[model samples]
Target: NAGLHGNWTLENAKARLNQYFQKEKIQGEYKYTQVGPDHNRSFIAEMTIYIKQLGRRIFAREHGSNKKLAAQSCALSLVRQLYHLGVVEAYSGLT
Candidate 1:
């Protein structure tokens, strides 16, 4: 598992996850669902990335103000989960 240091925004977190996935040569899927009313919209992002060695999908979901942010939040949540599972490592420099 590689280490991630410092705080990260939604975009930055997504970028880091991509880089990590690239480095590990893994593939995954992403999905998003819209929630709330038109004038007060929100999103829920879901990810189904596989951990080949574990033979399981690291499913994650999160809510955000928009689609992109929602996806990023989900990705970040997935990364943290991976860290907890000993699949990755990250520093909680500033959550």
Candidate 2:
């Protein structure tokens, strides 16, 4: 089985997420927020994901050291969950 142990990045997550979204006609949006100044800052990303095929709406959130990482963290986890739930295809070239 394919897992997200390594080589899981935001770009890869989004790419995989998009393919299914188009195939399944799913919908999604992203929200990002940051707190504190440059000295002590944290980026939090939230995803509103609606899986039309499953009739399930999932709300996901993750924090990171920066905006990109935050979004990437959340996106990667979303893909990870789908892999576990058997909603997506077999993934390779990663963990």
Candidate 3:
């Protein structure tokens, strides 16, 4: 089950992502770009986490009002996906 939800700060999400990455020995890269109009000034963050052992890459994307939020959301998306797929253990205190 998914164990993390709610509003997580960019640092919080990054810490969790890093924990998983180190534990699993995964490599990842982040890509960010402006996707919205000037008035909105939104951003799109794409996170590509690669598992070299499995030869698989997991991509997660999210749109946010700012760069930090976008990156946090994107990273959380990848973490959630991994938890759902049983690639990582779902931490306690999740609903």
Candidate 4:
């Protein structure tokens, strides 16, 4: 698993980003032109999943799984709760 170097806790991509980059491609063509203090507040405990493997220590992954899962789960839950409420499905194009 690729991670930000040092004690910096990088935001979970699955939680923070809408795009998915290959974990192996973290060394891509992005330049680090700014720095900031570690801000761990953006992470929520409910959105994390921890798994352990023999000889591998504790492994933590984003709990939402992937974009498809996140979208489906959100839509399904919303529809289940608002099935008869004339739910308006609207999406604005990405900026």
Q: What are the RMSD figures for all models against the true structure?
A: 4.6, 3.1, 3.9, 18.8
User: What lDDT does each candidate get?
Assistant: 0.73, 0.73, 0.71, 0.25
Q: What global local distance difference test value does model 2 have?
A: 0.73
The per-prediction tally of clashing pairs is 0, 0, 0, 0
Q: Write the per-residue lDDT of candidate 1 for residues 1-95, one digit (tens) a residue.
A: 22442344454577667867898798666787889999999999898887865678778889989887888888888777666777765554454
Q: Cα deviation of 41 in candidate 2 (Å)?
A: 2.4
Question: TM-score, each model?
Answer: 0.73, 0.74, 0.71, 0.23
- Selected candidate, larger lDDT, 1 vs 3: 1
lDDT per residue for candidate 4 within 7-94, as digits (tens), equals: 1112323222122123223211211212233552222122221112122212221213443444333333322222223221222223
Model 3, range 1-95, lDDT digits (tens) per residue? 12243433344567778887788776677788997688979898998777554578888889889988888889878767666666655454332
- Give the candidates in order of lDDT, highest first: 2, 1, 3, 4
Q: TM-score: which is higher, 2 or 4? A: 2
Among the numbered candidates, top TM-score falls to 2
lDDT measured at residue 49 in model 4 versus the true structure, 0 to 100 = 16
Error of 2 at 27 (Å): 4.3
Regions more than 4 Å wrong, model 3: 1-12, 24-27, 52-54, 93-95
